[PDB]
Design a protein around this nucleic acid. Structure first.
Ligand SMILES: [Mg+2]
Ligand SMILES: [Mg+2]
Ligand SMILES: [Mg+2]
Ligand SMILES: [Mg+2]
Ligand SMILES: [Mg+2]
Ligand SMILES: [Mg+2]
Ligand SMILES: [Mg+2]
Ligand SMILES: [Mg+2]
Ligand SMILES: [Mg+2]
Ligand SMILES: [Mg+2]
Ligand SMILES: [Mg+2]
Ligand SMILES: [Mg+2]
Ligand SMILES: [Mg+2]
Ligand SMILES: [Mg+2]
Ligand SMILES: [Mg+2]
Ligand SMILES: [Mg+2]
Ligand SMILES: [Zn+2]
Ligand SMILES: [Zn+2]
Lengths: 120, 97, 206, 129, 87, 25, 217, 81, 96
RNA sequence: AGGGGAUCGAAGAUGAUCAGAUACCGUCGUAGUCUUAACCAUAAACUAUGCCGACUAGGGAUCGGGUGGUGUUUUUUUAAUGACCCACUCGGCACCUUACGAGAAAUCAAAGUCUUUGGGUUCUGGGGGGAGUAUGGUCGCAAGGCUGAAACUUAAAGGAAUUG
């Protein structure tokens, strides 16, 4: 079974956390990045790492991945934010209950009247 | 110390119920404390139903199951049937499934 | 200290009954709620929205009252409140916490979730109970969106809503945001329907 | 059966306080209850109370604040011999600076400091702090 | 808590729950002080000026924090209706 | 031993001393 | 070097709060020992007891060591910290720090005359942890501290001069007796004597006054 | 709760309570003036009957008893005072 | 209030109960039964002098193994026979 | 002491099992089991938790009683009934969640309102064994019930929780 230990996945996290611009869907260069950017003691463990930080990368492309957040996302969401143009005064009048109308009366004033009963 | 609030089993405001006899070993046990299953099952069974209707008269017949209530004695309930043993907590759960 | 025309306006009243913020809980009904107003038969309890509004006003009056508007904190693990709080946070100071809380946020500096606010707002003291609890380990006042069945231990100022879903929590969070800006804030005078759509706050789809 | 009517009235006040309330409805009131309520009020430990008149024996609503830790009754009304009052307040008052033991003398239902000034003695009722 | 000749002795005179006038002792880290901001003519919340209230942890635990806030703020003039002294 | 049977032990034990004492009444 | 975390930590080193009575006023939860260090340096420790405890594990016994330290001045501030580690020193190291954090105030008073500087207590006070109840009684001046050596030493560092003690329970188990005599003095500032019925305006919170001068980066 | 008017409680929540647990206690039974137009005069009846009250002159009936309130007999009327 | 009558005239009962229950006190019971004077080899007194019958070699109780060197003494005021221990190394050589 | 004696079945006798097997398991089956007349008075006769009274906190069920309704369903001609539904209110048997509070804990709406120690009252316990033994009294046909010690011995016995 090829389940990656924590030191692998923990490094992968931290690396993506702070070098997302740089790194790519390509292990081959993500490999070479690790040299210049990370200190590791063995070839094996380094490819082991970049191999997975490349995997992680590759699916951040299609949606977020819990664990890692480089704040670029939290503010990609902030400009991605908007919807609506139609809201919820159409059509006609606010349909209310018997007492809801009694509520309006017994506190306030103007409202479109549209009452309904009900049963057990 | 104590282990259940229902003590043995289900009896609050009564002082004496009345014993049943264990369906398996015949041990007496108060009816409230019994442990019970309706042994609803078919007269025929799995495979027989085809071979039932096949070599019978009438259209498909009707089919009438058997119904008999089962009374176990705790040990007998524990030795096979409904029992396991639960955690300190799961014990509290009265829900069946 | 009663403002003047900070009374419940018709446009607000319309606003609220469309969201059905006056539709309080069924049979279920915590002793500690006079925010009621005559039980609609067939198991529904109508909510005095003036008090809803009047409490909302207080809410805003205390949210805005905190030197640095950013260590005011919104919470909602309830999905229907996440898109809400993120939006409330955006417009005002306020640090947001949508999704999983993660306990030990308020005790234990050692956590990276570590906050340390002067005030807390919350959408459903059942689901968010964590927050409510942890704050009480450490004198952090709590504001809360509450229905008629919500637990009122360790929340001060209730805002009677309808966490049954839909547009209410959004509405309430909106108005919350609306009135905090309308205090010491980047807003304006009278009627002032305010540029921002109320459907901005809302749980989306599918 | 209902034994010291004083007792229930006191205990009720104490569970209102503890539960943090501001009001008690006590039942059934009495000459003595009033005169005990009357002393506490005189010294701060409760607000204003009110006799309501059911045509029966009475009810009282007491309004209290929270200056009060405890108001107990001494259930056998022991006799106290003007020396012995020192030994009472010692056993059951928090310190020598405040709190009162209230008792009952021929000269009236009074706290022990008024008892000491008036210099009379008698039976012991209860206490307030 | 003075002494022989005047002289305020004994440090630190504790706060007080504005709802039950019991002491708000130190290790009570469940207690709360709510600052309600004074406003002025047309919105405007006047930073650094509050009508304030302090509530013991006891009270909050018992759930009586809200209804007690209600009564206090209103009879201090920043709520009208909402609360009711009768039940 | 079971308390129940220790009680029986001494039930008997007394019956014998009850017996042996009678020989001497 | 220090470097705090917590609003409160920062405000302290930043010489914006001078004394704990401030912190106690607004009941601010301490969480970094250095806070009560700069705030109150006359603190001297005292390791009261050390007792071995043992756990069995699916592979090995674990006999670590439990130590009970009491810190304080002798001018109204005490601390009772209890911690177990597997080395006696690091057990004593950790406990002191918690004992710092634990530091609570004491309300002392006059047996029963208004004279020069309080020597005894304000009231009678009881503390009960586990099965021991420890009862503290105001005593006339020069009475001494009337308590077993341990509970005495805690009453002294606490700064009491004259008090009577009465104990109830299995008191030979120190860990619970001190935890109770700790509560007993910690309860002197819960007690509404008449001289405190006076109303105070209700102070403003250090956290809001030096709000700017705190806050994270 | 925690602070309320024991002295002036709302008519409604006082209404629902038991007859022995109202502020000052009092009854919840009433009296009525009952007719059966054969006659001209009107016998006063207690809301709770026990005795199956008979009219002034005619042995007619009027009401029957129950667990509580009387069952008034078919063709009748009443006011309450 | 559990148990004890709290009445103002309930002195008698309250006294009596005490007398009754003092008997569950080991020493009080011994004192009044005169157990001292009655049983007990000495008079009830502090010492007693008697005469040596045989020198004994009592084997100690576990977990100790020893021979303990004692003397059977027949008390002089009593005739009652008693076995006494003879403290310190040797010393049994002093008796006879 | 009569009756009854189907069933199951202390004792006994057996078939097996066993190193043994006076047992467990199988068979036979006496007393008994049932009833009348009279005894006996004991059970872990248990909630291992005295009774009366006050107070302290939330929730949905339910059993009995009652009150309220331009509620449902029953059709006939509407009713009247009855059963059902909803709210409330007494008083029951219980469960739920909480815990201000209590506890050595387990847990407890009492086991709470206790060193801030007092509503009224009853009863029992005071380390363990010796021992419910000896003795005397008394009740009983008996078996036994009630009352009920000491000498001597002894450093623990015991409880709740923890990790193994
Ligand atoms: Mg067991
Ligand atoms: Mg029974
Ligand atoms: Mg002979
Ligand atoms: Mg020692
Ligand atoms: Mg005895
Ligand atoms: Mg010999
Ligand atoms: Mg002689
Ligand atoms: Mg037979
Ligand atoms: Mg045999
Ligand atoms: Mg054989
Ligand atoms: Mg045999
Ligand atoms: Mg018995
Ligand atoms: Mg039982
Ligand atoms: Mg209840
Ligand atoms: Mg030994
Ligand atoms: Mg055990
Ligand atoms: Zn069985
Ligand atoms: Zn007539």
């Amino acid at each position: 079974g090829r389940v990656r230990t924590k030191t692998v996945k923990r490094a992968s996290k931290a690396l993506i956390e702070r070098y997302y611009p740089k790194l790519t869907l390509d292990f081959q260069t993500n490999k070479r990045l690790c040299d210049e950017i990370a200190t590791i003691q063995s070839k094996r463990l380094r490819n082991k790492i970049a191999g997975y930080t490349t995997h992680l990368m590759k699916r951040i492309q299609k949606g977020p991945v819990r664990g890692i957040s480089f704040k670029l996302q939290e503010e990609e969401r902030e400009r991605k934010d908007q919807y609506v143009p139609e809201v919820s005064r159409s059509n006609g009048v606010l349909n209310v209950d018997n007492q809801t109308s009694d509520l309006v009366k017994s506190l306030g004033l103007k409202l479109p009247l549209s009452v309904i009963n009900v049963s057990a | 110390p104590k282990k259940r609030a229902s003590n043995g089993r289900n009896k609050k405001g009564r002082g004496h119920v009345k014993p049943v006899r264990c369906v398996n070993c015949s041990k007496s046990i108060p009816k409230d404390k019994a442990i019970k299953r309706m042994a609803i099952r078919n007269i025929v069974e799995a495979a027989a139903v085809r071979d039932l209707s096949e070599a019978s008269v009438y259209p498909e017949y009707a089919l009438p199951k058997t119904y008999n209530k089962l009374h176990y004695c705790v040990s007998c309930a524990i030795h096979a049937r409904i029992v396991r043993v639960r955690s300190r907590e799961d014990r509290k759960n009265r829900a069946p499934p | 200290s009663l403002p003047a025309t900070f009374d419940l306006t018709p446009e607000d009243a319309q606003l609220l009954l469309a969201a059905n913020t006056h539709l309080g809980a069924r049979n279920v009904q915590v002793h500690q709620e006079p925010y009621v107003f005559n039980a609609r038969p067939d198991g529904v309890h109508v909510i005095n929205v003036g008090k809803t509004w009047e409490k909302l006003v207080l809410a805003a009056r205390i949210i805005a009252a905190i030197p640095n508007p950013e260590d005011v904190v919104a919470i909602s693990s309830r999905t229907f409140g996440q898109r809400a709080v993120l939006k409330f946070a955006a417009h005002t100071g306020a640090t947001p916490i949508a999704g999983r809380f993660t306990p030990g946020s308020f005790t234990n500096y050692i956590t990276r979730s570590f906050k340390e606010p002067r005030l807390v707002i919350v959408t459903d003291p059942r689901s968010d109970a964590q927050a409510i609890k942890e704050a009480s380990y450490v004198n952090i006042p709590v504001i809360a969106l509450t229905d008629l069945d919500s637990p009122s231990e360790f929340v001060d100022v209730a805002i009677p809503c309808n966490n049954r879903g839909k547009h209410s929590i959004g509405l309430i969070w909106y108005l919350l945001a609306r009135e905090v800006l309308r205090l010491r804030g980047a807003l304006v005078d009278r009627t002032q329907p305010w540029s921002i759509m109320p459907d901005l706050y809302f749980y989306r789809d599918p | 059966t209902r034994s010291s009517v004083l007792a229930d009235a006191l205990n009720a006040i104490n569970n209102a306080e503890k539960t943090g309330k501001r009001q008690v409805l006590i039942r059934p009131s009495s000459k003595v209850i009033i005169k005990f309520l009357q002393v506490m009020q005189k010294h701060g430990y409760i607000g204003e109370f009110e006799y309501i008149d059911d045509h029966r024996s009475g009810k009282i609503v007491v309004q209290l604040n929270g200056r009060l830790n405890k108001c107990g009754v001494i259930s056998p009304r022991f006799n106290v011999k003007i020396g012995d009052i020192e030994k009472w307040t010692a056993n059951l008052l928090p310190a020598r600076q405040f709190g009162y033991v209230i008792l009952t003398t021929s000269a009236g239902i009074m706290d022990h400091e008024e008892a000491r000034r008036k210099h009379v003695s008698g039976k012991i009722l209860g206490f307030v702090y | 808590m003075e002494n022989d000749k005047g002289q305020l002795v004994e440090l630190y005179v504790p706060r007080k729950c504005s709802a039950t006038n019991r002491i708000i002792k130190a290790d009570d880290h469940a207690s709360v002080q709510i600052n309600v901001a004074k406003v002025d003519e047309e919105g405007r919340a006047i930073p650094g000026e509050y009508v304030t209230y302090a509530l013991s942890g006891y009270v909050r635990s018992r759930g009586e924090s809200d209804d007690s806030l209600n009564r206090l703020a209103q009879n201090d003039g920043l709520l009208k209706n909402v609360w009711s002294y009768s039940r | 031993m079971r308390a129940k049977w220790r009680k029986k032990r001494t039930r008997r034990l007394k019956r014998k001393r009850r017996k042996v004492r009678a020989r001497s009444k | 070097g220090w470097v705090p975390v917590t609003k409160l930590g920062r405000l302290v080193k930043a010489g914006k709060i001078t004394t704990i009575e401030e912190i106690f006023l607004h009941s601010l939860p301490v969480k970094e020992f250095q806070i009560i260090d700069t705030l109150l340096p006359g603190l001297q420790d005292e390791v009261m007891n050390i007792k071995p405890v043992q756990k069995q594990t699916r592979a090995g016994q674990r006999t670590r060591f439990k130590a009970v330290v009491v810190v304080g001045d002798s001018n109204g501030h005490v601390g009772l910290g209890i911690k177990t580690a597997k080395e006696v020193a690091g057990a004593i190291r950790a406990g002191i720090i918690i004992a710092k954090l634990s530091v609570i105030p004491i309300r002392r008073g006059y047996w029963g005359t208004n004279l020069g500087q309080p020597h005894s207590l304000a009231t009678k006070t009881t503390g009960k942890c586990g099965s021991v109840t420890v009862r503290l009684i105001p005593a006339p001046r020069g009475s001494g501290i009337v308590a077993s050596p341990a509970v005495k030493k805690l009453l002294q560092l606490a700064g009491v001069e004259d008090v009577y003690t009465q104990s109830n329970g299995k008191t030979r188990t120190l860990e619970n007796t001190l935890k109770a005599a700790f509560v007993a003095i910690g309860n002197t500032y819960g007690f509404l004597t008449p001289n405190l019925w006076a109303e105070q305006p209700l102070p403003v919170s250090p956290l809001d006054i030096y709000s700017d001068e705190a806050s994270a980066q | 709760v925690l602070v309320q008017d024991l002295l002036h409680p709302t008519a409604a929540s006082e209404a629902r309570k038991h007859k022995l647990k109202t502020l000052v206690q009092g009854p919840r039974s009433y009296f009525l003036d009952v007719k059966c137009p054969g006659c001209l005069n009107i016998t006063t009846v207690f809301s709770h009957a026990q005795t199956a009250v008979t009219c002034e002159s005619c042995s007619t009936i009027l009401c029957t008893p129950t667990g509580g309130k009387a069952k008034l007999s078919e063709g009748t009327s009443f006011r309450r005072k | 209030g559990k148990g004890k009558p709290r009445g103002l005239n309930s002195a008698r009962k309250l006294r009596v109960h005490r007398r009754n229950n003092r008997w569950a006190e080991n020493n009080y019971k011994k004192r009044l039964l005169g157990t001292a004077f009655k049983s007990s080899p000495f008079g009830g007194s502090s010492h007693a002098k008697g005469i040596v019958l045989e020198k004994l070699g009592i084997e100690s109780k576990q977990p100790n193994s020893a021979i303990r060197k004692c003397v059977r003494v027949q008390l002089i005021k009593n005739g009652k026979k008693v076995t006494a221990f003879v403290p310190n190394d040797g010393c049994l050589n002093f008796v006879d």
